[PDB]
Amino acid sequence: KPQFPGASAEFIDKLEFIQPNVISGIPIYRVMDRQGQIINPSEDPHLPKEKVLKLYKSMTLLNTMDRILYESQRQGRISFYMTNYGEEGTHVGSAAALDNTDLVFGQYREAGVLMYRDYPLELFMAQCYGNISDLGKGRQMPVHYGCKERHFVTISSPLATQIPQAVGAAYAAKRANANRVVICYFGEGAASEGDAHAGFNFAATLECPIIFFCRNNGYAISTPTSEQYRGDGIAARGPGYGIMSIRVDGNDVFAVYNATKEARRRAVAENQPFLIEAMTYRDHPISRLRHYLLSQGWWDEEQEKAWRKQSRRKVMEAFEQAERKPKPNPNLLFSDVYQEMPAQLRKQQESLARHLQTYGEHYPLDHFDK
């Protein structure tokens, strides 16, 4: 009987390498088929109509906003934009399964989480425009959203950095003892960074109530997953860290919802991490949910038309007000570097003010506040 502290195991008397099973991987959990039909009645969450309609309206409203801001980017009205196409169901379905005060870390494809938590169109827009309504003060590139009120930690561009941070926040929540989970979104690309390894391992050994939500769409920019990893996706990594793992159909809001609801329930009760890998495309979550609504009698062509019209108008009202707002005062380039402003930073602020008094005609001052 083996006496090694590092591992709990029998002896074996024959040489045998462990082979990965990548050809038949962790199967993909699905609740509804491509026609919006429930496959297995015992798995139906039976979400009420009001809630299912809110999922549908959040996904479509996001998609409307994507269309417009993507065009805005194309004309150089905004400098950058990441869309949410194919990712609407992973984000709205997972968000619906959280408590509203569960803390969210993510990156570029998580606008749907905010949309579900009713973040105003005005504030999505203010950030992309860097205008005076932006609580981010116009400091970051577009789509770098954050909302303290809606427990959505500000996005930063370096990939995977939020993963070990999300673990620290989950640990602090555990100690604070008020029944909260953290969720942390990242793509399959970002899962290759050393920080993913750091976060997964810390969550397991420190026993943190965290959901890791990996969006696997098969691509990181131009890099197919065949160049990204050789195991069975991200889900097969979870068990090697001691993490409970599942793979789900990212086009199925109900599958995403079910897996997130159950991961949240068990993460908070047991203080242990859960890994969800949602398979998406770089057959669509919106049209699948649409088919489901129709079979229930809960949507029709007329409501679809009226909703496309109303959501286009809401987005265009926001878009135009966002474009017409001034940018923040250029003084705001100097605040919040530290909480207080160091005397030497204030001196740099004063030198800018002095500079703009002599040379101001050469700066775009008329677009900026004060």
Binding site: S156, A170, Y171, G199, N201, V337
Partner: protein
């Protein structure tokens, strides 16, 4: 001035600082490699037994994780005191520090912050640490707006400065000169107290030349001042910089306006070292007062060597000879 004191060496004054913080702040936790049993330099002895295994705990062996983890704790408002085992091993966490911690508040418009984070780390040469147990990384961090870098010269200084870091509302790196951990003890107040950040201390007044240093190197320049006075009749003002960024430009400039001469010394390599920032700034503010060129007596531009350490360090003879030349310019 500060109530009851007892004799403490540098590591004990750190433990005292950390004890006082945990006692008064229910959110505070301490974590890193090997901190549970007391740490490899004994700075956390007794804290886990006293405060509980959920407040004083070991992490997996991963510096980028330790810092990322500390940032996430601080994001919720809780005090996170992270340890990195040697300053030489802070580099895996460099992206978490520079791109994340330092920018957390700015980039969010102050919606989020990790101000309640402090990273402590043993620092500086030790006689035989060679390449990876000797480093002074402070100049790497001085070029990153949004963090504070603080380095004490003694036990009394270390406890007061560490308490300020821990309570400061900005992410702080506190570098502890490991050669002083078991060196001479001094009297250190038992109860908490603070020493202000971004404030240099004139430890000895002088009229001919300003000497500036931080950490162990403060003791070297104190000795240099003593050699100058005795051998040369020269009166040195000795200044402990204490905070690397944001640094105390006024105290250094006011001293140089009085003396007209400056020598800056640090163990870190010359090129890109923090003495160049001090020198170029004092040159700008005290140009007309300068009697001689500002002199920098630093480690050589090489990695930190094992067997050649005695010949590498900016010791008192190196500093003294530069001071002598500067006085004769």
């Amino acid at each position: 001035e500060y109530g009851q004191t007892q004799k403490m060496n540098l590591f004990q004054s750190v433990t005292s600082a950390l004890d006082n913080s945990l006692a008064k702040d229910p959110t505070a936790v301490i974590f890193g490699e090997d901190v549970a049993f007391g740490g490899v330099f004994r700075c956390t002895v007794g804290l886990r037994d006293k405060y509980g295994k959920d407040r004083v705990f070991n992490t997996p062996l991963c510096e980028q994780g330790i810092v990322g983890f500390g940032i996430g704790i601080a994001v919720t408002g809780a005090t996170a005191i992270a340890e990195i085992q040697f300053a030489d091993y802070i580099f895996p966490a460099f992206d978490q520090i520079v791109n994340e911690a330092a920018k957390y508040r700015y980039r969010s418009g102050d919606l989020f912050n990790c101000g309640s984070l402090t990273i402590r780390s043993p620092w500086g040469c030790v006689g035989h640490g060679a390449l990876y147990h000797s480093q002074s990384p402070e100049a790497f961090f001085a070029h990153c707006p949004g963090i504070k870098v603080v380095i004490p010269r003694s036990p009394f200084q270390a406890k007061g400065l560490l308490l300020s870091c821990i309570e400061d509302k900005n992410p702080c790196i506190f570098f502890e000169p490991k050669i002083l951990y078991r060196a001479a003890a001094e009297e250190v107040p038992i109860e908490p107290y603070n020493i202000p950040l971004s404030q240099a201390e004139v430890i000895q007044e002088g009229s001919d030349v300003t000497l500036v240093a931080w950490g162990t190197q403060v003791h070297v320049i104190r000795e240099v001042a003593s050699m100058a006075k005795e051998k040369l009749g020269v009166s040195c003002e000795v200044i402990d910089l204490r905070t690397i960024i944001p640094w105390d430009v006024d105290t250094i400039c006011k001293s140089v306006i009085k003396t007209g001469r400056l020598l800056i010394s640090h163990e870190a390599p010359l090129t890109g070292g923090f003495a160049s920032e001090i020198s170029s700034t004092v040159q700008e503010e005290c140009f007309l007062n300068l009697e001689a060129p500002i002199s920098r007596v630093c480690g050589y531009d090489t990695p930190f060597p094992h067997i050649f350490e005695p010949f590498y360090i900016p010791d008192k003879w190196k500093c003294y000879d530069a001071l002598r030349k500067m006085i004769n310019y």
